Design a protein around this ligand. Sequence first.
Ligand SMILES: [Cl-]
Ligand SMILES: [Cl-]
Ligand SMILES: [Cl-]
Ligand SMILES: [Cl-]
Ligand SMILES: [Cl-]
Ligand code: NA
Lengths: 121, 118
Amino acid sequence: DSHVSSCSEDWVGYQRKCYFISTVKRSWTSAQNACSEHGATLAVIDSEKDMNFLKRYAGREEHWVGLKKEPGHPWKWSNGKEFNNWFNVTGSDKCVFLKNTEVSSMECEKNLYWICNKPYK
Amino acid sequence: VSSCSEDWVGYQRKCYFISTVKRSWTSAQNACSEHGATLAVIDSEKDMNFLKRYAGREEHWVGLKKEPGHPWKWSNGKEFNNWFNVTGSDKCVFLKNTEVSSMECEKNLYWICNKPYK
Ligand SMILES: [Cl-]
Ligand SMILES: [Cl-]
Ligand SMILES: [Cl-]
Ligand SMILES: [Cl-]
Ligand SMILES: [Cl-]
Ligand code: NA
C-alpha cells in the first residue's frame, strides 16, 4: 500500500480537511455547485481551530462558507450538522460569509468569493 | 501515513507551521529546525500570495537573510535571485498581507516554517 495522505493539487490541508479558495465571485448557490463539482461543500467549521484557520485563509475579502438558514428550519452546515450557534452571525440574511475580521450574512444572490472544504483520509 | 502533521498546513507540496508566539529570527529558525523545517522558503507567486494572505496584518519572519557582502540566501542555502522586492535595509526578512520587508533580527515577530510533504 503506497498511499500517502494529503490534499490534491491546489487544495490546502489542515486538521484532516482539504480546503479550496475561489478566484472568482459568484452567488452562494453557484459557489455550492462549484464545490460539489469537486466533491466538496462550501466550508464547514467544526472547531475553533477550523474557524481561526478559515478566517486567516479568507484574508480581507468576504468569502461564502457552508452555513445557511431556511425558514422553519434551524441553521444548518452543508454537511448536515445542525449549527449549535457557538458563534454569532450578524446581519439580516440567509447565507453566511467570513473574512479575517468578521463572520456575518449577506443576500445569497450577491457575488462573493468562496471557500470549499471536504474531509480527507 | 500522511504528508503533513494535522496541525501544520499543507500547500503545494510543502507543510507550513505558523507560530503562535513572537520570537527573534534566530530563535524562530532554531524552532523550525527542531521540526525538520526551516523558516519559510518561497518558491513561487502562488506560495507568496498564500503566505501574505495567511500572515494577515501581523509581521511574520520568513527564511531569507542578507548579510552585507554576501548574496541573498534562503534558509535552505539556495541563493535568492530577487524575483520579489524586499523594502528597507535590515538583515532579516518578514512579510504580511501588505508588505515584504526587513527588520532587525532581534525583534520578536511571529514566524512561518516550511518543509517538504513527507
Ligand atoms: Cl475559482
Ligand atoms: Cl470576480
Ligand atoms: Cl455547530
Ligand atoms: Cl508557536
Ligand atoms: Cl530564488
Ligand atoms: Na495538514
